[PDB]
């Protein structure tokens, strides 16, 4: 059997409710040895080793967990056939993309969680975890970057996003679709991501102890500039704008960010709009202001690539090419 | 023929391309008599009168334009058979919802835009504008609230959202679906909104000249609490959290807003996730901290209802009632 | 607690899997008396009486089960507060619409199934059944027509369709969206179908022991007319064309069906295309040929309305009126 | 500039009616010179040669047009830089997959239609044609198989399907998603089909004047077996079942096709259900009956691969291996 390491970080898959039909619970309550033993069939398709890295709700996910996870996987790559990371759904799409750019291991790295607490009727965690291990054990899963396996679907860490607050089917790759579908432990893979990932990226966090400070500001009618101004006064290295439409900024946010960019704050235009690219050549002259367009990266993912971009360069022209290749 | 008043506010429907093949353009620079003459077929279905209220890209939409639009429709209601507002697509969903709560005219009020500039090769604007006027002149359009007509679809102002940065088919009612489909100038209406709108809401902005201050903060991994701190230091009346998953907040944004809530800032838990409700009875005890759950309202829409709720009450229990009925 | 009757017909929610890691199985095995025993929680929300009316895979669903189901509900209406019908997922969308037209009981009639076998890890059935009973027990579910409750969503029987082959989230109301979402045993209803259902239809199967014969022919490049020829020769009362695009027909199929319409076979143009209306005033002159356009009814659902229309009228103009109202 | 051959076959892109505003029209009315002359901007990107192969509605597409199109592309491959095929939307997805398998030219072959006739207000054809020519002229479009370009999207000919009867955005790759998006004449390609196409298929139609006879039968409640019997009685080479759910058959249709397969008719189980795979190891024991499972191929596309499969072999076991590779 392949050797699979489960790195547990918490989430609703480790999530514990008061009853089976009542929606109240706490993420990150159950340990990894209890997750594995709840699904005995795991032991017939893989030699499973668990470690608990942290036990938090992914709403509390942060740079320190991200750095720990990249280093652990890079370090233990040689000692295992594949990794499964149990994680909350809330920021799974962020950790998946971060590991997609930082992991130098091209063994399957699969992230999995659950939308329903382990204590609820029709808990999705068990089958998700089973299918995550199936995916991490498949040689065909190798070299596709960091994968998210939820609801019988293998999704790439770059395009995967939580599209719904409660549905077991919430995770979708809203721009380019999934890599594969799992039926009876077999994966019909018809796609692989084209942007560079894992071992093909220049980002190496092995020596990094902290990442550049990147904040996100929301745009909306009558938007306040206070959020943008607070991040600039705090000396943030980068700001992502969750623009309206094709990455457009409310006038006062535009002014504050246009200024901050002249003073060498990195500014990426992304969109609150869940699907499609924030493009160049629309209503914002990026060249004039030193702004980067995020393409299909949504604000929280844009933050991820900007943080890693700002470990190599502060040049907007170079951050743009980073955003066009990763 | 029915009298239809078109109130122009700008946007890409009044948007001017550098060219037809080229995607570069400026929003809100063509006047309203130019939109009407550009579609002469309107003259056979309606008696169209145009007024220019403003000429802005809707990325710059604000409280003043909203109050003006509401005051104008309420004043002119008995002068016309229907309104069509031309509007930029970027913040159309925010404007439609505001007017859906504040307009006391139960004549059809229809909002329309274009995703491609008028100068573009297969400009969506002419047909949108025709169908908006058709919709505004159908007697069956009355009593459904403020409508958005885009891509042959009638959407209610509450649920409609921009789902894609560039696609002509971007506007979708992502939780509950459209009200109707237009073919050959006929509308198959199979739905009507259940939530109270227009003349069944207590909200009256007719003697208001300013609205309560409500800002939105974004949640993500390692989120800064400075955006939230800046808004409470500036004495914002209300804060909407674009939370992760089912309205969850990052640790420090939590601690900051929980203190703000107990010092009389209205705090609404919404979600960055594009579909589904921020529910009560998940991971956050709203009763303990005095938080309101937005339900299906996305952050920018939750802001609109919070702004209005704060003209009547600052009691969180009552503001939750409002979010459960409007 | 309210009185809820579960009428079992079979399906994957009774479908005993080969096991937990296996999606190979047989639909129809277990019986009503041991549904309330697998889901003890039902006893906290309803006084549940279960009757088995048949035990089949819903791929074998037929006119006889439809008539017995409708007469059952009509007869027992006054003896219960609400009905749940457990059903295979494959033809749920047909039965649901059949009942939606023929049931005269305006108490909740809720259909429910399961996409995963009862033996599967993360089997969906139990929570679906719980939620179906919550929906049947909620007095706000009254007068909305026949309901399908799957994946935490209340769907109307006219628009619900199976969109995916395997996904637990397969059931969507693809044209007009769902009526409500269920969270923590509470339903947020924001819609009700406008089309006439149950009590407001003139269809009465109370005295019918048989239905008109309506078949379905598929269109595609180089479509054979032999399917259409065979149903016309066998004296079928009605043919539903699953056309290409906007209900268009291959020339030789168009030919057979224009002749059949002339010899008094009822012909309904529908579409293989999963979403959108088959409209009048497109490429087919329906007035000329005696054809009816199905609107948003897909081929299967249009079969259901044609069968029932044919019990009142054989006049194309009148069948078209029926198609524009139910 | 590159040499782009447009092979015209007709469709609504070459369709006209009496009105910009009225929906009535005839497909395949306008010649290719009129389409090209309608978009002068073409002259700035390609050296366009147009040939009229046929002028039909794609509802009338047939095996002769398919063979003519495959032979033309194969014969003229070396004389041009890329091909654009103007086609009706109704059976585009069928033709596109036929060519994806039979074309041996690996220059861009791009198909394109319009959902609105050329005479309509906001006609989609012009910009779709511009973008199909941009796609055929882009060197990144080579080696991705036959492409469909619609609504700014580059779609692979295998997964693409028409999802809506009227919407300009109807074409989606519903299982695996699109290959690329077009903004401002630039394609962000992030995917390529992994299933073998064009020059890696063994299928060669260069010597064929006929394709084996394959018909499609539809499954529903109380389905008639006469359509299936009628194709067997006519000695059809192949039958594709449009099954319910995961490729299931009504009892009479099952019996007729079990019988037929026993007697040497190739039987493919597909599904009426628009998304997801018809899988093996579900409720039908395919090995026992000699049935092939379509995977993600819908009925009309399973017909294409079965027709070509039947030119190499009649062994169900080998036809299944083809459905797993192409
Ligand atoms: N708050 C939870 C939600 C989930 O896991 O589904 C988390 O992200 O950890
Ligand atoms: N920025 C433009 C976008 C549009 O109109 O499509 C506006 O919102 O005014
Ligand atoms: N084949 C089953 C499908 C299911 O219930 O999931 C049935 O329709 O009976
Ligand atoms: N019937 C037309 C429809 C279209 O092209 O949109 C065709 O397929 O030729």
From TrEMBL, chains A, B, C, D:
InterPro entries: AsnASE_II, Asp/glu_Ase-like_sf, Asparaginase/glutaminase-like, Asparaginase/glutaminase_AS1, Asparaginase/glutaminase_AS2, Asparaginase_C, L-asparaginase_C, L-asparaginase_N. Residues 213-323 form the Asparaginase/glutaminase C-terminal domain. Gene3D superfamilies: 3.40.50.40, L-asparaginase, N-terminal domain (3.40.50.1170). Keywords: Disulfide bond, Hydrolase, Periplasm, Signal. The active site is at residues 12, 89. Its main location: periplasm. It catalyses: L-asparagine + H2O = L-aspartate + NH4(+). Its EC number is 3.5.1.1. The keyword Signal applies. SUPFAM superfamilies: Glutaminase/Asparaginase (SSF53774). It is an enzyme of class 3 (hydrolase). Pfam families: Asparaginase, Asparaginase_C. It is found in: Periplasm. Substrate binds at residues 58, 89-90. GO terms for cellular component: periplasmic space. GO terms for molecular function: asparaginase activity. Residues 3-194 form the L-asparaginase N-terminal domain. One of its GO terms (biological process) is asparagine metabolic process. NCBIfam families: asnASE_II, PRK11096.1. PANTHER family: 60 KDA LYSOPHOSPHOLIPASE, L-ASPARAGINASE. Belongs to the asparaginase 1 family. This is asparaginase. It comes from Escherichia coli. The lineage of its organism: Bacteria, Pseudomonadati, Pseudomonadota, Gammaproteobacteria, Enterobacterales.
């Amino acid at each position: 059997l392949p050797n699979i390491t489960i790195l547990a970080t918490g989430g609703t898959i480790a999530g514990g409710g008061d009853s089976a039909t009542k929606s109240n619970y706490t993420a990150g309550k159950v340990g990894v040895e209890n997750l594995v033993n709840a699904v005995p069939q795991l032991k017939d398709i893989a030699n499973v080793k668990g470690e608990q890295v942290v036990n938090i709700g992914s709403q509390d996910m942060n740079d320190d967990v991200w750095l720990t996870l990249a280093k652990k996987i890079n370090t233990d790559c040689d000692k295992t056939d594949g990794f499964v990371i149990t994680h909350g759904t809330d920021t799974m799409e962020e950790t998946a993309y971060f590991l997609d750019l930082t992991v130098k291991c091209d063994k399957p790295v699969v992230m999995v969680g659950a939308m329903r607490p382990s204590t609820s009727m029709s808990a999705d965690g068990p089958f998700n975890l089973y299918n995550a291990v199936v995916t991490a054990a498949d040689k065909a899963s190798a070299n596709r970057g960091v994968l998210v396996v939820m609801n019988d679907t293998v999704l790439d860490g770059r395009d995967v996003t939580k599209t719904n607050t409660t549905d077991v089917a919430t995770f979708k790759s809203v721009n380019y679709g999934p890599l594969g579908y799992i039926h009876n432990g077999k994966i019909d893979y018809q796609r692989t991501p084209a942007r560079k990932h894992t071992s093909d990226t220049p980002f190496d966090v092995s020596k990094l102890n902290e990442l550049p400070k990147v904040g996100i500001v929301y745009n909306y009618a009558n938007a306040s500039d206070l959020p943008a101004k607070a991040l600039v006064d705090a000396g943030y290295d980068g700001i992502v704008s969750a623009g309206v439409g094709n990455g457009n900024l409310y006038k006062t946010v535009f002014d504050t960010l246009a200024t901050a960019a002249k003073n060498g704050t990195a500014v990426v235009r992304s969109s609150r709009v869940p699907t499609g690219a924030t493009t160049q050549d629309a209503e914002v002259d990026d060249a004039k202001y030193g702004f980067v367009a995020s393409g299909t990266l949504n604000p929280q993912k844009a933050r991820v690539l900007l943080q890693l971009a700002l470990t190599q360069t502060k040049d907007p022209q170079q951050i743009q090419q980073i955003f066009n290749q990763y």
